[PDB]
Design a protein around this ligand. Structure first.
Ligand SMILES: O=C(NCc1ccc2c(c1)CCCN2C(=O)c1cccc(Cl)c1)c1ccc(Cl)cc1
Length: 376
């Protein structure tokens, strides 16, 4: 895969070995970001942010330092807007934080809100570099509140993301085999992809050990919420000193993951076609991905269809290998639906949004299942 797309051999779409510390110039940002749970509880978070001076972004030279600053400012912004998380909000982001956040966001080509690429793909480290990428040798860099299960939620998402890297690297073999008319190589590649997608499902199972239903629904879901079609911020958020009018941006989502879409594109599963709501949403979330990763998706669309090729051959072995990949995606959507039931639907019904996500996932699963050449 070409280096311009920023896809790593080991970790795929995740940022390899992210930066932990900023330069000493930005100590004031780091203190607030490192102690969000404490400052929110004492009721001093909004005070500390308002007392900040406006720091220039020019000392953030390299890409990794810039991605770290985005995560820092992203988490602070979520804490400032939502606060304790029981209705008391802020609709204006002070200039001292809003200006450098938007400047940095424009530079990287991402919107000025916390996205999946911040809080999963760049929000990680390993404890011992000599030891491999396991949960016990890994940690997140930032959290919102004590007992929010942010470590479990983000790290398990990252581990699934890392598992998918074994499949992503096979993609060039698939397209090369098609243009070179190499049937046996194509079959082998498709079987290898299917196997890696099956292993990714098994990695997903870890979520039950590290995430609690109450904690996710009542705490973490609040802080990941955005300001697009939200009654609490009907007009959006005012970024002081940068834009005059308030702007709307969508909150964090699994739809922002590139792995969520790239295998549907590869296999010709028409997810973003027909102008339905699910199709529109998947296209919209491409602008919430890093530019190199959105470029990768549309470049996949530029290549000839893997589905049409496999259909023309009249070869049962090839059809089987194709369906194995499709069946693995059906299994992944089905498991995601189970996770939505446990962590959102049941907690919501017990106390005196979740429905929409279920329906979206049912449409995505339905489209995937009907792309099967033979019934499973
Ligand atoms: O929903 C979240 N996490 C659970 C979750 C839910 C779903 C999937 C993933 C994480 C990670 C990879 C994509 N993903 C798949 O299920 C999938 C689809 C196709 C292929 C493969 Cl290998 C995985 C989540 C939501 C908001 C934020 Cl701010 C961060 C994470």
């Amino acid at each position: 895969i070409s280096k311009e797309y920023h896809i790593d051999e080991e970790v795929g779409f995740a940022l390899p070995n992210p930066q932990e510390n900023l330069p000493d110039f930005y100590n004031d940002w780091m203190f607030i970001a490192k102690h969000l749970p404490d400052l929110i509880e004492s009721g001093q978070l909004r005070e500390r942010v308002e007392k900040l001076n406006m720091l220039s972004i020019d000392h953030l030279t390299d890409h990794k330092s810039q991605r770290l600053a985005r995560l820092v400012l992203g988490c602070i912004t979520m804490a400032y807007v939502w606060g304790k998380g029981h209705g008391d909000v802020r609709k204006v982001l002070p200039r001292n934080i809003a200006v450098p956040y938007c400047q940095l966001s424009k530079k990287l080509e991402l919107p000025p809100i916390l996205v999946y690429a911040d809080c999963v793909l760049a929000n990680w480290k390993k404890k011992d570099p000599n030891k491999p990428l396991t949960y016990e040798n890994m940690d997140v860099l930032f959290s919102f509140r004590d007992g929010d299960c942010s470590k479990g939620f983000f790290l398990v998402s990252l581990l699934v993301e890392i598992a998918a890297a074994s499949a992503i690297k096979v993609i060039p073999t698939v397209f090369k085999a098609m243009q070179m008319q190499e049937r046996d190589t194509l079959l082998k590649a498709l079987l290898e992809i299917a196997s890696c997608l099956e292993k990714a499902l098994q990695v997903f199972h870890q979520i039950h050990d590290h995430v609690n239903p109450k904690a996710f629904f009542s705490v973490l879901r609040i802080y990941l919420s955005g300001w697009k079609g939200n009654p609490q911020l009907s007009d959006g958020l005012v970024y002081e000193g940068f834009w005059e009018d308030p702007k709307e941006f969508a909150g964090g989502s699994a739809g922002q993951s590139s792995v969520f879409q790239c295998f549907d594109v590869l296999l010709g599963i028409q997810q973003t076609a027909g102008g339905g709501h699910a199709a529109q949403f998947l296209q919209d979330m491409r602008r919430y991905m890093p530019p190199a990763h959105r470029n990768f998706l549309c470049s996949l669309e530029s290549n000839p269809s893997v589905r049409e090729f496999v259909l023309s051959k009249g070869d049962a072995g090839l059809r089987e290998a194709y369906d194995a990949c499709v069946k693995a995606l059906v299994s992944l959507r089905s498991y995601h639906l189970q996770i939505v039931t446990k962590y959102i639907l049941i907690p919501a019904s017990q106390q005196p949004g979740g429905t929409d996500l279920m329906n979206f996932l049912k449409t995505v699963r339905s489209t995937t299942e009907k792309s099967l050449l033979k019934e499973g």
